[PDB]
Paper text:
Here, by studying CRLs in the SKP1–CUL1–F-box (SCF) family, we show how neddylated SCF ligases and ARIH1 (an RBR-type E3 ligase) co-evolved to ubiquitylate diverse substrates presented on various F-box proteins. Notably, numerous cellular neddylated SCFs and some other CRLs have been reported to associate with ARIH1, an E3, to form ‘E3–E3’ ligases in which ARIH1 serves as the ubiquitin-carrying enzyme. We developed activity-based chemical probes that enabled cryo-electron microscopy visualization of steps in E3–E3 ubiquitylation, initiating with ubiquitin linked to the E2 enzyme UBE2L3, then transferred to the catalytic cysteine of ARIH1, and culminating in ubiquitin linkage to a substrate bound to the SCF E3 ligase.
Transfer of the C terminus of ubiquitin from UBE2L3 to the catalytic cysteine (Cyscat) of ARIH1 (in the Rcat domain) is mimicked by simultaneously linking ubiquitin and the catalytic cysteines of UBE2L3 and neddylated SCF-activated ARIH1. c, Post-TS1. To visualize the TS1 reaction (ubiquitin transfer from UBE2L3 to ARIH1), we installed an electrophile between the catalytic cysteine of UBE2L3 and the penultimate glycine of ubiquitin that captures the catalytic cysteine of ARIH1 depending on native reaction requirements. However, the catalytic super-assemblies, which involve UBE2L3, ubiquitin, ARIH1, RBX1, the C-terminal regions of CUL1, and NEDD8, are superimposable for a given transition state for both substrate-bound SCF ligases. A 3.6 Å-resolution reconstruction largely resembles the pre-TS1 intermediate, but also shows the catalytic Rcat domain of ARIH1 and the preceding helix gripping the UBE2L3-linked ubiquitin. The cryo-EM data show that NEDD8 forms part of the E3–E3 platform displaying the UBE2L3~ubiquitin conjugate. Next, the UBE2L3-linked ubiquitin would lure the linker between the IBR and Rcat domains of ARIH1, and promote remodelling of the linker into the Ub-guided helix, which directs the Rcat domain to engage the C-terminal tail of ubiquitin. The Ub-guided helix and Rcat domain of ARIH1, together with ubiquitin, form the ubiquitin transferase module. Upon the TS1 reaction, the C-terminal linkage of ubiquitin with UBE2L3 is severed and transferred to the catalytic cysteine of ARIH1, allowing relocation of the ubiquitin transferase module from the outskirts back towards the Ariadne domain.
Numbering used by the authors:
A (entry chain R): 21 to 59, 67 to 108
B (entry chain H): 280 to 390, 406 to 554
C (entry chain H): 98 to 140
D (entry chain C): 260 to 686
The structure:
Amino acid sequence: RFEVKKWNAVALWAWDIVVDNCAICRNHIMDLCIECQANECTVAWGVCNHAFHFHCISRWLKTRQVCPLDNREWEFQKYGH
Amino acid sequence: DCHHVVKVQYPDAKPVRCKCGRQFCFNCGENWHDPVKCKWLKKWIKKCDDDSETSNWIAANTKECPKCHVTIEKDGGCNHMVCRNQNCKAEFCWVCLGPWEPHGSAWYNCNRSRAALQRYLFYCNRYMNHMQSLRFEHKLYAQVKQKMEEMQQHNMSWIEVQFLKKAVDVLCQCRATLMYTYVFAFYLKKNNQSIIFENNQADLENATEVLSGYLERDISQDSLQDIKQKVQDKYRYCESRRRVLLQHVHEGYEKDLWEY
Amino acid sequence: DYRYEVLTAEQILQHMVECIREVNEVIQNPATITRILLSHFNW
Amino acid sequence: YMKKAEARLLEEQRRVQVYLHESTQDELARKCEQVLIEKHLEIFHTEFQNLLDADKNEDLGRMYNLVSRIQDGLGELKKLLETHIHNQGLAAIEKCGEAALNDPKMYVQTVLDVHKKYNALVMSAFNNDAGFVAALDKACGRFINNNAVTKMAQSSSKSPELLARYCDSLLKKSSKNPEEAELEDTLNQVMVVFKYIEDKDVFQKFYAKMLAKRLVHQNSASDDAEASMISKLKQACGFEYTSKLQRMFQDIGVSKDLNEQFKKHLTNSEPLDLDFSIQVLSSGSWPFQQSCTFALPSELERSYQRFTAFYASRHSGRKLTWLYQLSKGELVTNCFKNRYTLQASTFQMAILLQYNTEDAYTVQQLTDSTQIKMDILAQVLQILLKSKLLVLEDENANVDEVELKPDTLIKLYLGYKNKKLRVNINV
Ligand SMILES: [Zn+2]
Ligand SMILES: [Zn+2]
Ligand SMILES: [Zn+2]
Ligand SMILES: [Zn+2]
Ligand SMILES: [Zn+2]
Ligand SMILES: [Zn+2]
Ligand SMILES: [Zn+2]
């Protein structure tokens, strides 16, 4: 009846994102950015619910202040850990 | 000089190989051009600006028969031209280039400033640079081969020079695909989805240069354990990146994302 | 896939009579007439 | 003739030191060389061939000395060698025939045997010449990548698969405990046969798959052994070749760590009745797919929600997707007559725990409460009925063959009695 003494489960771990390319380096989000790869690389989120690598969106904002999928203004809303 | 007809079930601008040793784009006729479409290749090769001038003449003194599409120069005065090809016996008007049946029958009478120059300069510069390098690949192959022999006789085995050969091959492929990508990046109106592309390709360009550098000088000697690791790590990166570039272009074609 | 094939002048000439046979299977005309007709219609 | 030629050359070098003037040694040596050898290369080549057919590894040394004494005489010897050694290795693994195509050990052992024999020959007889080693290496590449086994299975991607499977069958946790000193050596030999194969990406696919299996199921011989194998793969192909494997390793380490912190935080939460243990993998590295649309039984829900809330605490934004298709536990069965202890997958647990209430459900009834897929239910229920825990309405029917329909009762066989305890109802 009771028949529950022990349980061992297996769970996949993934970022909380809808679709995965980072759309700057075109890598896969879980992989390393185009900079950390030619050798910490967390994920940054946008107030419009867009997600990018951190080192990618950093350089992009260094040059131009537009979220590069929706030609709008950009500011950080949720970092990633 | 080859004499072989390449029969196919369907014309689709895909590449074919002749068995004489050549591979061409069955539709247009040039060498295989993977990211860029045929029409832009033609428009860029006309004014290619550093390989041929007879195209200037052809554009300046010839028209094209609408039916058979061969260049025709006129040295008569009738305007009632008749195409003297093998099986294109069509007749038309030399000026309007339309059919002659009504034309002149009863009453139907026929009668780059500053910025573009700089852009074209930059793009044509890169394109010609890569053309020069792709023309010298024979020298590159022979160079690395002789160097393989030399490094081998000085107490180095055969497997090392094997990895070196593979690296060279990947390098040549990456240049041959940066070529046509520059062409494609000419006819492209600047929007967000174009800065992304023109920013990835610069990085791949730089990596290509670094690898083509590693080879020539740092072949020197007796540093195998590190130089070999560097070169392997550096050509896997280049190959992956160029596949990313091609996939980006084709996805853009699918989703109608570019603007010219 | 992209299925193609490579031929020489002799084989590409014999393929003409091959196509003529294929069409004359159903048209039932002397070979010369079939060749003329098909050649007018861009093969 | 070779022996006498050697003796004569020795003599006529000595003679110049007792009679003649020193500025004749080179010329006399050159002439005696051009006459004694350098004018009989053809018979030398034929004899060299016959010697290779036999195994006389001493006179071959003499021929090396002699032919090397003249200009470029080795040029035919290298090619003749490479040809013979290729043929020998190919015919050697030919004897295996089909028996190899399904026994990795014998195949890899045969390749290693041929390679060792001729490496041993061309290190003593031929003074470890460069070009001769090159001949060895070219021949070994040729006859590893294409051979009888490659032909029979109809591809050139069978040798890498077989080598990957051999390394698998070697690093598992078998009955015997392997000795670290022997294990390290045997891996070092697998690395040789690796460095000869020319398609080193199929090998990575297969090795990644097998490592994933044996890491998930806690079934591995030695952690230091796994680390050493990964390390030499990296050293032979670079940090980009073995990134997925290093991540696939480090995250099992991190999972083992994090389970302890869950235990610590568990001191103030009183886990209802069960020993919980989880493994939290990355998402790009591992070759696993999403799920099979499971409905979680009410028994585990408490621990499920407590752990998901705990995980969400220590990290910013992260989404666990539990995959139940590979996750096992333990049941106590305090309902039968002999106090057994069952051990099965979570699917079995859902289906069995259903019968905690009643014992008269049908295939459709089971589908309603556990939301499992049709074929999956078919397989699981078939395996259960194979065991004497669940019986059909019939008693002697070939339950292994007679499939059932949604309107088919399943009877909890109360009279089940295994001979021993701790039954392992799994495939
Ligand atoms: Zn990064
Ligand atoms: Zn946005
Ligand atoms: Zn990125
Ligand atoms: Zn040709
Ligand atoms: Zn084309
Ligand atoms: Zn015409
Ligand atoms: Zn006109």
